[PDB]
Design a protein around this ligand. Structure first.
Ligand SMILES: Nc1ncnc2c1ncn2[C@@H]1O[C@H](COP(=O)(O)OP(=O)(O)OP(=O)(O)O)[C@@H](O)[C@H]1O
Ligand SMILES: Nc1ncnc2c1ncn2[C@@H]1O[C@H](COP(=O)(O)OP(=O)(O)OP(=O)(O)O)[C@@H](O)[C@H]1O
Ligand SMILES: Nc1ncnc2c1ncn2[C@@H]1O[C@H](COP(=O)(O)OP(=O)(O)OP(=O)(O)O)[C@@H](O)[C@H]1O
Ligand SMILES: Nc1ncnc2c1ncn2[C@@H]1O[C@H](COP(=O)(O)OP(=O)(O)OP(=O)(O)O)[C@@H](O)[C@H]1O
Ligand SMILES: Nc1ncnc2c1ncn2[C@@H]1O[C@H](COP(=O)(O)OP(=O)(O)OP(=O)(O)O)[C@@H](O)[C@H]1O
Ligand SMILES: Nc1ncnc2c1ncn2[C@@H]1O[C@H](COP(=O)(O)OP(=O)(O)OP(=O)(O)O)[C@@H](O)[C@H]1O
Ligand SMILES: Nc1ncnc2c1ncn2[C@@H]1O[C@H](COP(=O)(O)OP(=O)(O)OP(=O)(O)O)[C@@H](O)[C@H]1O
Ligand SMILES: Nc1ncnc2c1ncn2[C@@H]1O[C@H](COP(=O)(O)OP(=O)(O)OP(=O)(O)O)[C@@H](O)[C@H]1O
Lengths: 137, 135, 137, 135, 135, 137, 137, 135
């Protein structure tokens, strides 16, 4: 149903919520320590290298409607993965962007949603502030 | 008038000044670095240059007249907390602060911050919510 | 009676004198090597993370009239600890300040005495020099 | 007159120049770095710029006419000891020096320093003493 | 006319601009760094200064009118790929790109690059071939 | 027949092709991990320090018509080796040059061919581009 | 007869020559690997910390007419040692100077000869050049 | 006249230019860095600024007219050896070079240097000799 690649503060944090709301989630990450840390939250916590076109097939990643690339300080895999996923014809692929340049490649690459955790949170914050006063509550 | 004041114009803080603007709201944006100030002068009702930690400059901005102040200082937990701690002094109704890490979050909870934001984590839970709603 | 958190040149050095003058002292420090180094001087040398609200309770730290935060190059714990201690309603809390900014947070935080080992020693030195000539000895 | 001379205006050395001043005492403060010199010109009876290690500049300041000289050089054990060693030459009655570490302390004891100060440790024993007196 | 365009004038890219010149061919050489541009102005039919990643500057050079574009960006896989990805947009017939490492090579294969060059390896196989022919 | 010293992207890559074309090759390199990595491609993959005048003799390096110094970020051994080889009266010695200065010493030293993987590839690239249009294919 | 403290290129190199000319030498150095490396050249190769006033006594260092402080990139021990030795009333103490400042402390400290391996070698070189032509040989 | 030429004015090389001077000998001192050149202009019969590796500048100094050239280049084995290798070309009678390490020494032996100097070691054997003579 929902696959999340890269378990950092952003990616992991989304695996939990997905769990808390009673949803099955496949969480993956080359680093095994990161995998064990969420084994209790994901319907399945696998260890793999998302960039490896084969391991991706090991996870039947092509059977998920949504995959979330949460790779962080690695514009390399973040981009390679998104590309690979784009081949498996994965319906919706959402990716975290590390910087501006990244956002651009991601757009053209074919990502369905780009997330800028920092900025995006900003908009949501201004939005929250706005509600507090407009709706008045 | 004088409802939102944003201190620290980084990717997070600045990004909220624009949105505040785009939604037709007046915003006071501040930041010691003048280059950062000029960069948002077009978005804020007022873009001032100042050192938030300086108890006097803070008074120069009538910061006590704002219902909401947002401390978006980043890689300088030092100022971030002093500011917040100063803001607390002026009895500023609502003060929201970005937390740099776990400790920072812990202090802010005891310092007296009204809302702590973890852009990274908090947005994560945000996306979980969206995938959930999409299906 | 007297609790000292952080056994560096400053903090430790005070544990000894407290000892030498026949006083019971509780010396604590996450780093165990630092703890063993003063085990012979303190009435009790515990290993703990002062920032951990629970471990602090493990030491009955709330039963001391004086606690000394001697944390050094860690404006983080130095500040968190002082805060935690300020909650346990610890009567007198003396803290070493790392820099100016630190001194300010400490003041507002609620510390009862801030120590600037470098500067403070200066005043004591000028004072000593002064005595040598004024009292004339 | 000409009783205290302080070489090296860092947090330690400078801090003692002010106190000397506050207590109404004349002080000669010196330091190669001119920015440090201007910073205390208001506190010292005389704020000179010089290289303490230079056996001649030392003579430019009549440093031999002071009963007390305080070497507050910090992260430069090199100068700190040469200075002290030069001061010893001029037969300066009392020379107190800040020690950077254990070795420095050891040399100073053999160099001929009259008093070695370990701001960190020495203040520690100072605080032990105060807690003791408070109870 | 308008047959070869080389983006990025480093040891690899520049070295190909000269040869193109030496063999009596017109070449458009480009590079954000102006010092690099002046260095080959003597070799290229046109040495422009620009940011290849900027979708507009690319249009300033009529880059879409070239049969061959060579991305010789080096230690900046970031631009190297964005450029290539932009070039792909303009439907540039043949785009050859230098690969910085294994990943870069992999993306370029999926990005749509027509030829990936690994100066180090590729030249190795080149020398193997020469020893072979010498004997 | 063909000896290759230094198995980096350049040097190794040439050992393979030499293999693929059915040629016997002696590949050497101090680092054993690099040696094992090509043991399957070379008629012989030895571990040695090319700069050691003795080890060089251990490999009968004087019995090869061609030796290729592919040492990379080590202008030291690259140069020492070429010198040593130049003593063994090795017929043809081809060396990879790290920078310009290196190229100059190599020329004067007595190297028979200097390779600038980066630049040389450039010329071959311009050449290829040229063929595509002149020969028209 | 001759004691040498610090076995670096300079210090060690002098232990050998002392040996080669049939002289007994005591070579010392905290680092044991350096000590083993000259055990075959010195009448005695001890491991110790020259700055330790006690270990120095362990070597009866006060029984030598000449001690050579060859400590290098350690203006600390080089100076402390020379001081300690100066207390044991060691007749002649020769020290390698690391920089100018060092040379000055050494002079005042009381060293009998300061050596600037770099510069001193220079004078000897100019001297050699001079002989080649003046004496004409 | 034209008997000694010293290339590279560092602690070693420069130190030999002075001594050559003090003993009343003419010396040509050279070094790319002009500040180093001015520093010894008072000691050398001629203090030129040049790049020893440049086969032409070397000719600008008539370096081929000197019986002895001393390469005192230090932390740049690159130039040190190229120079020496160039000097060899001009058939310079005697060329003495400072060796930076073991390798450098090995190449110089094969390059054709007439004398290799290891300031550190060589002086060590020098001191051994003096202690020996003192007793
Ligand atoms: N090729 C890969 N395949 C799968 N997972 C990967 C791959 N490369 C890196 N990761 C994982 O993705 C994450 C890297 O992103 P990053 O380093 O930014 O996380 P972080 O810095 O620790 O926390 P944050 O994402 O909030 O900055 C790590 O959890 C890492 O283990
Ligand atoms: N004492 C202060 N008073 C007011 N503004 C400050 C103060 N200190 C820093 N700032 C400003 O607030 C921001 C600090 O947060 P931060 O350092 O993380 O920004 P950044 O690192 O440049 O970019 P980012 O926020 O995305 O990490 C900077 O824009 C800085 O100019
Ligand atoms: N969270 C913590 N809880 C308890 N003790 C801590 C904690 N964090 C650090 N310490 C201790 O406090 C000390 C850190 O301060 P610091 O590093 O400045 O000491 P130092 O640098 O070695 O000597 P000095 O204090 O004189 O500069 C260490 O002894 C460390 O083990
Ligand atoms: N040779 C010298 N003669 C006179 N003054 C000197 C000399 N060398 C350094 N100083 C001065 O004395 C001080 C050296 O001590 P130090 O380097 O520790 O000061 P600091 O590091 O800038 O601040 P702090 O003393 O708190 O560490 C500096 O203020 C420096 O300008
Ligand atoms: N966005 C860009 N648009 C156009 N040219 C660029 C861009 N980014 C970098 N360049 C240029 O292309 C080259 C980048 O490749 P690279 O960084 O490897 O050159 P280099 O490191 O200076 O030397 P070398 O190519 O031999 O490693 C540089 O010459 C740089 O000036
Ligand atoms: N003295 C030596 N004798 C034999 N082989 C050596 C010697 N010194 C280094 N090598 C080998 O030569 C190579 C060093 O060149 P280099 O470091 O540039 O290779 P690389 O950087 O890993 O890849 P590339 O050559 O494409 O840059 C290594 O494979 C190393 O093990
Ligand atoms: N306290 C000490 N007591 C005795 N020997 C010491 C002491 N401290 C350092 N040494 C020795 O003295 C030497 C340090 O000088 P140094 O580091 O300059 O030698 P090096 O750099 O390896 O070679 P070179 O002296 O030619 O520069 C080492 O051999 C070290 O083991
Ligand atoms: N190609 C060159 N031609 C002529 N002179 C050069 C060349 N390269 C460097 N030099 C000079 O020769 C010297 C190089 O030796 P080195 O770098 O060791 O001097 P240093 O490091 O500044 O001081 P020291 O010699 O004591 O280590 C420098 O003074 C430098 O200016």
């Amino acid at each position: 149903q929902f696959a999340v690649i890269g378990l950092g503060r952003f990616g992991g944090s989304i695996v939990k919520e997905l769990h808390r709301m009673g949803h099955e989630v496949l969480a993956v990450d080359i680093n095994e320590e990161k995998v064990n840390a969420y084994a209790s939250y994901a319907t399945h916590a696998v260890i793999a290298n998302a960039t490896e076109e084969n391991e991706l097939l090991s996870l039947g990643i092509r059977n998920f409607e949504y995959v979330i690339v949460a790779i962080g300080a690695n514009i390399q895999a973040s981009t390679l993965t998104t590309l690979l996923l784009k081949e498996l014809d994965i319906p919706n692929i959402w990716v975290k962007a590390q910087n501006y340049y990244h956002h651009k490649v991601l757009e053209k690459i074919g990502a369905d949603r780009i997330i800028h955790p920092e900025k995006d949170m900003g908009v949501k914050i201004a939005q929250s502030l706005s509600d507090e006063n407009v709706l008045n509550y």
